[PDB]
């Protein structure tokens, strides 16, 4: 009992290209013949039963199939003896209608009486297509649109895991992906004119798109805008996809072809951040539609048990300002290397203020939060960095190492010195 590839209804018939169809859809598949009850193709007018004409496609599948040539296969004899035949297992049209050659321990089983039958095999073209699954899986998929510049390649590397599968359209894109991953599984395709490395034993699979679905945990689609539309539908019939694409420019002058599914897929626009690290981007994400990707290093986050004066000090209320400290409201549109979020007063912090305070610093932020009130507004875990930090403190240069100790030496630890301020740079040398 087979179901229709279009609508999922019971399917007694099939297209020559391997699509199971219900009675209704026997007459809306212009791609190739559909042998119906009278033994002729629907709409052929070979007899009076097949005179009603074919209708226009009811599915995007039909539009996709306009670029997929039907090549009629050879008419081959199927020899039958006690329900056994030499022909390969599959599905065939015969004078007794559509029949299946099943694999078995005794042999290739076929439910037909002894004889010889002229047989045309169904092509594999739409053997794995299921448009009700495509619809469902499209909803549970995502299309990651990249930014104008770079970074889209590095998003994938942070997301990919050893159990995952990455589908890619060409030999070259497959090679590009394999080089970017470093360690991955694959089978070098026959006939290729590229120099493929050796495949690893572990890592994500890199599969050529034309090869079709193979099982995995998460499935990705590389170069989505370049991919074969029918192959994409084959995948979406079996799994959901994370589909990677580039920034949509205004080029359409017949210059844009991509699978229709991407225009109805849930979309995620990537945005490059140059001001602070990824850990900050993650904490602030709830306030933004775009997925924020840091194109710079991790911003340090340290939870001090006692007050401190590193970099610019920030605090909600004027009452708690000391020395050259400012309010969080006064810090809007200002940028620093180091910042100290000073929160002595209970219930003094909301989302808006906290968002401003967290997004001022470039390299480090120290948070004095004795009331533990930042937790109730933000998820911001403590993050260290193996770096030698440096900043002024009331007309006096000072430096702190990776373990947040006030060391005053000349490059003793042997770590990097991160700083972007005008005064900190020039004073650093001399
Ligand atoms: Zn149907
Ligand atoms: Zn067809
Ligand atoms: Zn007919
Ligand atoms: Zn790529
Ligand atoms: Zn394209």
Numbering used by the authors: 4 to 433
What does the published report state?
In addition, this family of helicases contains an N-terminal predicted zinc-binding domain (ZBD) which is conserved in all nidovirus helicases, including 12 or 13 conserved Cys and His residues. In this paper, we present the structure of HP-PRRSV nsp10 in full length and truncation, which has a different domain arrangement compared with other helicases.
Basic Local Alignment Search Tool (BLAST) searches of the PRRSV nsp10 sequence among the solved structures in the PDB database revealed that the sequence identities with known structures were low, with the highest value being only 30%. We determined the structure by single-wavelength anomalous dispersion (SAD) phasing using the signals from the Zn atoms.
